[PDB]
Amino acid sequence: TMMSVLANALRCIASAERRGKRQVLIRPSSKVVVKFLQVMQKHGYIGEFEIIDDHRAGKIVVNLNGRLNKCGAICPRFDCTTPDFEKWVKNILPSRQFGFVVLTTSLGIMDHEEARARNTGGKVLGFFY
Amino acid sequence: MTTKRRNHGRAKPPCSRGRTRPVHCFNCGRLAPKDKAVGRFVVRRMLDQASARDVAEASNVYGAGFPMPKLYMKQRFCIACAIHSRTVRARPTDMRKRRFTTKV
Amino acid sequence: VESGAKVLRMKEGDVQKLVAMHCHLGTKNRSNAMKKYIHSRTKEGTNIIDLHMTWEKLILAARVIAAVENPQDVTVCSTRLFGQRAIFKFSQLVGTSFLAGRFIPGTFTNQIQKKFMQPRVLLVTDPRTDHQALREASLVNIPVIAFCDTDAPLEFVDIAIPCNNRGRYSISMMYWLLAREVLRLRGTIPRSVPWDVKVDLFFYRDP
Amino acid sequence: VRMQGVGHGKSASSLPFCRTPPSWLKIASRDVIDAVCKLAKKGLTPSRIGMQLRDSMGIAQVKNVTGRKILRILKHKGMAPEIPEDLYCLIKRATEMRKHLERNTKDRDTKFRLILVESRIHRLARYYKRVKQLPPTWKYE
Amino acid sequence: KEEWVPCTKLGRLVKEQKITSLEEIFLFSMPIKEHQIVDQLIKESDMRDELMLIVPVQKATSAGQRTRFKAFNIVGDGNGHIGVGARVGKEVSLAIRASMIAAKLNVVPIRRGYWGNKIGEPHTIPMKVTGKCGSVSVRLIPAPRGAGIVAAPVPKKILEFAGVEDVYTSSCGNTRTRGNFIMATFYALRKTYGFLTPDLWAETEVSRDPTDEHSDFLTMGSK
Amino acid sequence: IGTYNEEGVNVDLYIPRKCHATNNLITSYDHSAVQIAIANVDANGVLNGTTTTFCIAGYLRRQAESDHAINHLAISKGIIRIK
Amino acid sequence: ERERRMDYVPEVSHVDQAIQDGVHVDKQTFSMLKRMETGVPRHV
RNA sequence: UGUUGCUGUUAAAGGGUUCGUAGUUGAAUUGAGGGCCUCUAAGGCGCAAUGGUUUAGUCCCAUCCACUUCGGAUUGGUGACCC
RNA sequence: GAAGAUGAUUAGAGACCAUUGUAGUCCACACUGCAAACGAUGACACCCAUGAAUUGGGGACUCAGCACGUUAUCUGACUUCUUCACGCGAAAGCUUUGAGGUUACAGUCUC
16 A cells, blocks of 8 residues: 555656656645645746545646656654754755755644744655755 | 576466476477477478379379378477477577567 | 738648648558547548648748748758659759758768768658658757658657658648748748649659 | 455446435435335345345435435344344355365365455454454354 | 868857857757867867876787777866767877867866855855766765865866866765766766756746858858 | 856856756757747738747657647647647 | 659649549548538539 | 665575564545735736727628639728737 | 396496386375575555557347457456667666666565
């Protein structure tokens, strides 16, 4: 089976992006997968997306503008902290300039940049370039 | 080691059988799997052309009267067997991959 | 295009010619990448090409050769007798360079060779056996336009015109339409008259 | 994937995309209920009750034309079986294999199958004593 | 050198003042087929030519054997242009002369960004990149200022060429075959512009090729 | 557009071209990334002069996705008619 | 080369277009034509 | 010795297969709200008005009739649509 | 037909070959679990393109409102492109059927 929802979604996006395809299908939907997409659509990396309803589990559909290069998943959801933002941001990303790690917090779902700003660490979620 | 042949010299595909019955040779009595073994179909004459004339003379109810029968057989050979009578020969890379199916 | 008066649009007599000389059909075999072009299949099993599709492709390729102001930089290439004739008659009018008979390797890449040339653009009768040309267009930054059999691959073909390349009367039509319209947009032959000379000049004859 | 041994199949039954009752079903909740319980007294399992209903009366789903499905009906009227459907069936198949094997101890296939069916029944058992639906002293044998 | 005759469109333009820089040629992708295109545009007193390797190769023959010499050249400007030749000639001086030609054909520009501190002009690669030839693959990591060129002497050269003064690196696989290491390192420094970043995109406009604009004068050129 | 300093001054040698189809950076290295220039036409068949431009990437001629994308680009700009 | 004289007054051109010479073609071709903006041309 | 960051087709290395406990890992739902005023803040595939002789168009019409690939014709026409 | 016996072959030869021949080869009930038991490719799950076929099911009087075939579609299996796309690999090769999606290194478990 699949033991991470995110992993199932963002291996469709990455593959599709490397083939230059301008839409992708996503088999499941979660409250979580939504939030992840939302982020990247603000910062300009996605055109739009639709959630469709089968009344069992939804099928997300996304429009890629080709502005992504990867969307990963950090699977164990390891604990990152106020000092350790530095660590992750160096090690898994090609840059500090345009690398975006996305984290979970009690507050919501947000970029590392906004995480530091509000001074709360948390468990990591995923990342994109 | 190196995969010289994809099908391994067999008409047996991976992940299906893994066992196909042995079959004797009409040369040396060697056994090999049926798929490996080298099939040919002979259609062997019962008379040479030269002699066919002479016998068809003395015939009235045969030859002219009915076309002569032939001995049919299937011949399953071993690898070594085939090669030595040069009915199968080594081929260059591009040609080895070619097949002619079961047609002659 | 627009703004425009429905200019360079298919007409009665245009269609009348195409149907007649049987360039509306393709080749019998189903496509490997040109599946979209095909409109149904006949009870002879031959795949008809849609007319509107083909027409727009032709107008497109006109806009390309119109955008070269020194026509000699465009090349035409055939390796088939049926297109051979039509090349020569085209290179007179439009003023394109050409090589026909057979493509020779290193005419677009080999420096030490007196048959060396650097095209801006390239055409072909068949991308299948003119293929050597295309693969040397790739490394010199030269776009391509081809006359594609439905069967044919589209590898190293940027723009593609669906076509039948079987028989004389098929191929001649296509070159004739291009040449016509090109000269209507450059040197301003009007579309008011039917074009000056005949498709029979573009037919291979044998000497 | 198939639980034990090889198999991938996609043979399945979908749902309606309309969860409200058809216009050609003008039958009320009560009629549906009555039909279920009536049939049940023959000793029919819910699986065949639903089949009889859908085919004869055109019922889309029991759940669509009543507020509840087939077991909930039965339970409330005290006709429900105390051995779940899936468990019972396996035990029947099991015993029948054991007959065949009693006679034929050379039979390789049905032996291996019985091993499967056994451990499968055990999985069910374990389940239904976590989620109470059998006594907590239940065992296959 | 000896007097030169262009057989290339580009070559003609470069011999005139029409194309006045590498940038024009690069920006609308066109191959450089004559090394004389480099020398004319980029003046000497910016260019450097080093020989990274010269080694014997041997080809087997019955009885005695023929020999040859492989060699590499490396070339470029510290303003962010690099290019690596490798060639083969039956004598020393042959393969040397040949290398330097090929090298100047293969020239490619270099993007240098920052580490997240912006002062002066670029001192650091814009991102991590990798390049691979054979089993070796290099990982270039961007470093803060004052780090220096932290790599082995072989890539230290190759990085000095490309104007990268601050980097941290590591290699993998067999690195003790010299030739493979060079090509690897070079493919890394290409991959910069091959990667899309937010700073670059804005749907930047394209315009006509130098070739096209100057077509008339190339016609006259032919005469 | 491009890398800047804290002083706002461009540091780049050049800003590479866009492939409109995939919105990816056309490299100098790719020589299969062709720039196709079509000449526009108005009423009475007069050329406006070369105005529009397409740019195709060299990753679209390694499987011939080129044709496909050119159509979607064209059709959107009203250049190619669909019914 | 100039043994090739292909100049004839219509000849094969308008004959093929049918002056009344006729053209007949598949019923799929027919269906395509009549759904075009041009519609069927005469003699088809 | 590769948690960060290893390898196992052929180079050292996937167990002959299946069942199966400890152990490890495990799908989706509950839902993170709104209005009135200012702001040229943007978009508009909403829209009353009224503008525009081809100072911009296409369908209809007029005249030809051209067997078939000419046209123009004015107020054309709350038409279409454009600033 | 191992072992054994006899005849050759050979410088030497139960050799390889020839004529024989015991255990064994077969079956029932017990053990053994030692194979290149191989696809030298662990198991489950997701994404991933080109063409032509085959194997089952489904879709548009008398074992008989039947059976086969063609066109088209679909789900499940085995594999070919000797025009398999991207990509990977030291190369040979691998390609929805992965050794691909991996230094931009993290789906899960185990040996």
